Amino acid sequence: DRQTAQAAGTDTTITLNVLAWLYAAVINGDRWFLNRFTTTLNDFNLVAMKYNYEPLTQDHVDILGPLSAQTGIAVLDMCAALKELLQNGMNGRTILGSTILEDEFTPFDVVRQCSGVTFQ
């Protein structure tokens, strides 16, 4: 049988967890995609929905707050960096010991003392 095909596998991607994963990538080192252009939450949400990514809200932005403190990258610049990745890709590169990116990773993990000597 083929219950919830695409609708529960490819129609959406957990944007908050991708932003969390990209903060972990910045923390590990990789930040070539990390522009400083900023973005509105509305235009970010529109680009997310254009490319099968969920919209984001202030309650979800707050979860990324301590990751912005640990890296100096404001959440709207992490949003703007993902907004660039959604339009340009990364398949010819590596970012976290892989050629692709993730949304499976649980959020709020990188609030720890991951300052450079260790990460997990």
Burial class (CB in 10 A: 0-12, 13-18, 19+), 40: exposed
The CA distance from 81 to 86, in Å, is 9
Question: 90, 101 in Cβ contact below 8 A?
Answer: yes
**DSSP character string of 3-60:** TTTTTTTTS---HHHHHHHHHHHHHHS--TT-------HHHHHHHHHHTT-----HHH
Q: Which residue matches tokens 């509105």? A: 40
Residue 114 belongs to what domain range? 1-120
Structure tokens at 49: 């929905």
Number of structural domains found in the chain: 1
DSSP, collapsed to helix, strand or coil, labels residue 113 as coil
Q: Which residue matches tokens 């990538």? A: 25
Domain containing residue 80: CATH number: 1.10.1840.10
- Technique used: NMR
How many other CB atoms are found less than 10 A from the CB of residue 73?
22
Calculate helix-pair angle for 75-88, 58-71, nearest 10 degrees: 100
